[PDB]
Amino acid sequence: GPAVGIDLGTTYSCVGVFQHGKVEIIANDQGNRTTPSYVAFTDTERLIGDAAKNQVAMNPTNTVFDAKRLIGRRFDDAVVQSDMKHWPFMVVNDAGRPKVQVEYKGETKSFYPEEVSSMVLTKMKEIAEAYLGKTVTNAVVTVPAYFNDSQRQATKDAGTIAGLNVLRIINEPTAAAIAYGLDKKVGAERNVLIFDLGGGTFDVSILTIAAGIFEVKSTAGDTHLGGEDFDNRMVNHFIAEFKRKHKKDISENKRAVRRLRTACERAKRTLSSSTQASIEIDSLYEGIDFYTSITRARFEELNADLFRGTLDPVEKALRDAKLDKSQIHDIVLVGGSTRIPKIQKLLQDFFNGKELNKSINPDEAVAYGAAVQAAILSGDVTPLSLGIETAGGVMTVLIKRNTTIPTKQTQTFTTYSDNQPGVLIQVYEGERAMTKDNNLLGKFELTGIPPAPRGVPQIEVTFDIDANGILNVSAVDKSTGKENKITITNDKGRLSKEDIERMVQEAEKYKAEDEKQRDKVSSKNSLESYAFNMKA
Ligand SMILES: Cc1n[nH]c(=O)[nH]c1=S
Ligand SMILES: [K+]
Ligand SMILES: [K+]
Known part of the structure; x- marks a missing residue:
């Protein structure tokens, strides 16, 4: 049967299939086109995806996420040592290799990052099988362009453990370009900039495409920049507003902060399509209702340094590629945060009004490209x-x-x-x-x-x-x-x-x-x- 394309993302994973001349992104059993890259271990069961993310607050030590950050890496790697400090779950050193250590069914258990990612891939394989009504074995799995051979092999191993035959490991920016059909354009070489702001990372990639061949000229970005940072700026602003108005700090109450953060996430999404959003929380703290509003301009002001900062990796990638901004033929927006109008305006203004490729859902473009490539693998310059x-x-x-x-x-x-x-x-x-x-x-x-x-x-x-x-x-x-x-x-x-x-x-x-x-x-x-x- 047809091979599938899988975006194994840091925060979420997405699976697509090319059938009937079109790519279909596949929804999970909860009806979601994206599945959280989360695995949770409990006294009675292992949860993968939405179920695992939903119970994270109840079971933080045994809910694993960000395995992509550890995949293909050694325990003594500086990235692993810095990242471990921000994780509730334990990371242990097994002979130089990091392993997540959790309590499962009353017993201590340890898993290599590829094993955790294999569990996410197993869920994506099962989601595809439920949709297609047939076994899925062949797959194309995407990785960041900056991934080394160890990270690529470990990602392939996760597919192999999940029972998938990984036809190829392809770069996420290349998959996004394939989704927009940029490799179908016959003619002189084209310089493509992929701006990927989603999944907890910001990635800028410059590629050259000619005769169906992609070359990665440069990569730049921030591995710790994403939508959560934008939500945090709103959460801190609201904590200050409540403190100024009611002389109360809600920071001590974890649930109150959690409810505020959920309202802020929803408001940020509303601000992508509307100029103002309402925050309505009953009994946020000490029985005090919090009913307020935030304008898009205020949200932009709270995140001005973060939004403007996205241009710095764009400038670095251009310098590394030895290219002027005028030499970019195609700009592609990938990641949910690219929906923010200020980010689109900043990038377009930087490129002198050049139109951006954004017609494909930014959350699904990488999986969409992987699905197109998987189908091709399944059948002058x-x-x-x-x-x-x-x-x-x-x-x-x-x-x-x-x-x-x-x-x-x-x-x-x-x-x-x-x-x-x-x-x-x-x-x-x-x-x-x-x-x-x-x-x-x-x-x-x-x-x-x-x-x-x-x-x-x-x-x-x-x-x-x-x-x-x-x-x-x-x-x-x-x-x-x-x-x-x-x-x-x-x-x-x-x-x-x-x-x-x-x-x-x-x-x-x-x-x-x-x-x-x-x-x-x-x-x-x-x-x-x-x-x-x-x-x-
Ligand atoms: C602003 C935003 N961020 N992420 C997302 O998935 N959607 C939106 S509209
Ligand atoms: K991926
Ligand atoms: K990204």
């Missing part, structure tokens, strides 16, 4: 960057990937050593900083360089690609006009789309190491007479 080896085994790119063909690019190079008699032109294809990590396509030598000090000889290297995709690489000694050249054949089927994707993924995985590495060689246009990779 350059593919890779082209360049030559410079001194130190460095990849110097003459043609970036996603360059339309035919194309011709020329750069000038020099000798690295004094009285260097010749240069070796080594042609490589790939996105890595060092040639050892890229693919060698061919090599040729330009000999007879007249003796000169290093940096004086000028060698012009030209990469020419025809419409058929054939690459001709030539080098000319600008002092004599002497030349040498190689023709590199483009075998049809030499590279699969998956082969290209793997090369792009490797660049994304080693981006920090490669970006730091580029700084090491001083010249960047100097050629040696030998292959660095063959040097002992």
Whole structure:
């Protein structure tokens, strides 16, 4: 039967299926299209999803949430140590691996984060099975773009424990782009910014899409920013208002604060569609009814620093991607908090009035994209960057990937050593900083360089690609006009789309190491007479 797409979120999970030409987001047994990523252990039973979230106040020590924060991580990781302080449940160290420790049926029990996430995935699998009336095994599960191999493998393991065959682990921003069909657009490469403010995290991702291939250029954000922060600002404001009006602090009473927080959450949602919301609480504290109102402008003022602060990760991602804001072709809004009008206005104003992609429910877009990809898995531009080896085994790119063909690019190079008699032109294809990590396509030598000090000889290297995709690489000694050249054949089927994707993924995985590495060689246009990779 059809594979499902699952957004395994920090706070909630969402499951969708592509059937009958459309994606259907599947509601749970309580009629909810999103299910809380919560697992609760009690004296008599294990609760998953809505039931677990509903009883959290009654059973805080044994209600687990935020397993995504621990997944694929070591106990001594700084993130784990800081996060544990904010959790009611215990996290224990089992041989360097974090485990949640809870009381279940009168017995102490410990679970790895992948096991807790497997329980959430089991609920999502069961919700899909109830809707489809058939067993669901195949699934595509989404993860944040910044997740490392350990976090990705642990997420896959959670699906495997749940009995799911994880066809692929895909980035949440990529899933959102697939939901908007941004990978179906034939033509020149497009730069896409995904603004994801929901699920307790703020994620900004910049992607480039061409020929159905996605590359993550940059990621930025705040792992501890979400709607709860906006609700807290309202709760503190109301606590102050009650204290000023009634000379009473309701902070001591946990239920009164809980009732106020629930009213604030509802009011914030009303403020997305209306300019004012009513707060009506009977007997909030000491028998005093709290009936009041909040304007959208007051809500915006209470959260002004948080809302404006969202632009700082957008600026950082643009800087990391080496792109101006004008170079973004598509902006996608993901996450429930993107419904807030002030956030939409701030982002649109930053982008000079550019329209935002927000037609898909922001809570369901990632699952929607995952479902589209799962169905695909169930049934001219350059593919890779082209360049030559410079001194130190460095990849110097003459043609970036996603360059339309035919194309011709020329750069000038020099000798690295004094009285260097010749240069070796080594042609490589790939996105890595060092040639050892890229693919060698061919090599040729330009000999007879007249003796000169290093940096004086000028060698012009030209990469020419025809419409058929054939690459001709030539080098000319600008002092004599002497030349040498190689023709590199483009075998049809030499590279699969998956082969290209793997090369792009490797660049994304080693981006920090490669970006730091580029700084090491001083010249960047100097050629040696030998292959660095063959040097002992
Ligand atoms: C403001 C807001 N936040 N989250 C959500 O799910 N909806 C809304 S309208
Ligand atoms: K996810
Ligand atoms: K997010």
